[PDB]
Amino acid sequence: QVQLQESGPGLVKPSETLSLTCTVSGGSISGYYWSWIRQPPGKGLEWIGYIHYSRSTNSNPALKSRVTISSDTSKNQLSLRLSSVTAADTAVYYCARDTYYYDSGDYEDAFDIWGQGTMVTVSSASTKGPSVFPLAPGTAALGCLVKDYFPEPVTVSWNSGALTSGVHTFPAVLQSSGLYSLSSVVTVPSSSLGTQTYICNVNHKPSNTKVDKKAEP
Amino acid sequence: QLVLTQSPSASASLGASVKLTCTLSSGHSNYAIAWHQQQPGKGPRYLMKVNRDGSHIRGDGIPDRFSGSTSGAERYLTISSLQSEDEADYYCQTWGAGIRVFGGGTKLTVLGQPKAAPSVTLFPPSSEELQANKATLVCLISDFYPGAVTVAWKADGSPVKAGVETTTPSKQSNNKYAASSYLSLTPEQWKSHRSYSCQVTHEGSTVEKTVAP
Numbered sequence: 001q002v003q004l005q006e007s008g009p010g011l012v013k014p015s016e017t018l019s020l021t022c023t024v025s026g027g028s029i030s031g032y033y034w035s036w037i038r039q040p041p042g043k044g045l046e047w048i049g050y051i052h053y054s055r056s057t058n059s060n061p062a063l064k065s066r067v068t069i070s071s072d073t074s075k076n077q078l079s080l081r082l083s084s085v086t087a088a089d090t091a092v093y094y095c096a097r098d099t100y101y102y103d104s105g106d107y108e109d110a111f112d113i114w115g116q117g118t119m120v121t122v123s124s125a126s127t128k129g130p131s132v133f134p135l136a137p138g139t140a141a142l143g144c145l146v147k148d149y150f151p152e153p154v155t156v157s158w159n160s161g162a163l164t165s166g167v168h169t170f171p172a173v174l175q176s177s178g179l180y181s182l183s184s185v186v187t188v189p190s191s192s193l194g195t196q197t198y199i200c201n202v203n204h205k206p207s208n209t210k211v212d213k214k215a216e217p
Numbered sequence: 218q219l220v221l222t223q224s225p226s227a228s229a230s231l232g233a234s235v236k237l238t239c240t241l242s243s244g245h246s247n248y249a250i251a252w253h254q255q256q257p258g259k260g261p262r263y264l265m266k267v268n269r270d271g272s273h274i275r276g277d278g279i280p281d282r283f284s285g286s287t288s289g290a291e292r293y294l295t296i297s298s299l300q301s302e303d304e305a306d307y308y309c310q311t312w313g314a315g316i317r318v319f320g321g322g323t324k325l326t327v328l329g330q331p332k333a334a335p336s337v338t339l340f341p342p343s344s345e346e347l348q349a350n351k352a353t354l355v356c357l358i359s360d361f362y363p364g365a366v367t368v369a370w371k372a373d374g375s376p377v378k379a380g381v382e383t384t385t386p387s388k389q390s391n392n393k394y395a396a397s398s399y400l401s402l403t404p405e406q407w408k409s410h411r412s413y414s415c416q417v418t419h420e421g422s423t424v425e426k427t428v429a430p
């Protein structure tokens with residue numbers, strides 16, 4: 001039940017330093033190497049580097065001059081600092097549990113638990129929260145239109161997470177304004193339209209925006 | 218230098234088997250690897266470690282349809298009884314001295330899934346959006362396979378090309394595709410026409426929905 005959770009700003013300006021944390025729950029960081037990995041949108045996985053809290057740290061030769069990885073035993077946390085960022089550093093960033101070292105010094109290689117990832121966008125544009133509009137409705141579709149936000153992502157749940165079946169949240173579209181929009185839809189039984197309410201819960205962490213909207217007939 | 222070579226894509230039919238390949242550079246031809254799977258829209262998850270001696274160890278919860286094997290510098294992931302959810306990107310990964318390396322990834326297509334015609338819903342601009350002095354028509358295209366469509370918009374039967382944004386079809390949780398098309402208008406444009414329509418073409422057949430102010 002070891003779980004990894006990445007966190008950090010979703011937006012940084014070019015030339016700034018990106019700072020992320022990886023918090024481990026359900027187990028200790030002791031004994032393992034912990035790796036950082038990133039994935040630019042639509043591209044492959046790139047290893048950034050790793051750390052063992054008492055053995056060593058290292059990083060990808062192409063990023064080493066900009067990468068500092070550290071650990072905090074009291075917080076059960078790993079950290080990544082990436083300096084002098086550019087648009088080429090826009091990516092989802094992951095941490096993962098890597099090789100275990102026995103205190104004899106022997107080891108068993110592993111790479112068996114991933115975090116969920118945190119999206120980072122490098123841009124001089126300012127954060128903007130979304131505007132949310134309902135898409136009003138033996139099956140019927142209804143939804144929510146989530147307009148004009150930056151950076152990605154927004155999360156959309158329905159009925160405070162209680163409704164997860166006919167739900168589909170679409171990929172965002174990048175507008176010529178530089179802002180994103182998306183929609184989230186649910187297919188519901190028509191017989192439920194007069195009695196069950198449907199409320200989308202929109203979360204935009206970069207702007208700390210939280211909006212509920214009812215999609216009513 | 219330590220290099221893992223994967224070809225970018227692979228393909229096989231629903232219910233068949235497929236063997237994905239990862240090739241180690243010659244100076245590291247005895248290394249173990251790990252296989253990772255990334256289904257569309259999700260983060261990666263670990264599948265298994267494949268050892269030099271040909272043995273393999275699956276991660277907890279990974280189906281036994283996934284197996285691994287070895288031949289020389291080649292490392293394999295065999296997926297049997299292919300299902301729709303196996304469409305994903307598969308990455309091999311290894312461990313060197315002070316470094317870890319990923320292959321470039323292989324995108325697996327699972328062919329021959331059941332054909333499904335799209336269900337189209339066309340939403341007019343909400344009264345809330347019109348009160349904000351904006352207008353978006355939203356054409357929702359649901360539950361189709363294969364995952365390619367084209368969309369045509371019309372205003373009173375005349376084609377509309379400006380202000381159209383259409384998403385690339387995405388797999389739904391039920392393994393059929395969905396897509397969305399948006400037509401951006403001013404409120405005055407919306408109210409000036411008798412109706413607008415969204416026409417979706419899928420496998421040579423068209424479905425049309427109309428909305429009126």
Ligand SMILES: CC(=O)N[C@@H]1[C@@H](O)[C@H](O)[C@@H](CO)O[C@H]1O
Pocket residue numbers: 033099109312313314315316
């Ligand atoms: C901490 C670390 O990088 N350990 C690596 C190990 O993962 C790898 O299998 C081996 C290859 O010879 O080299 C070691 O230095």
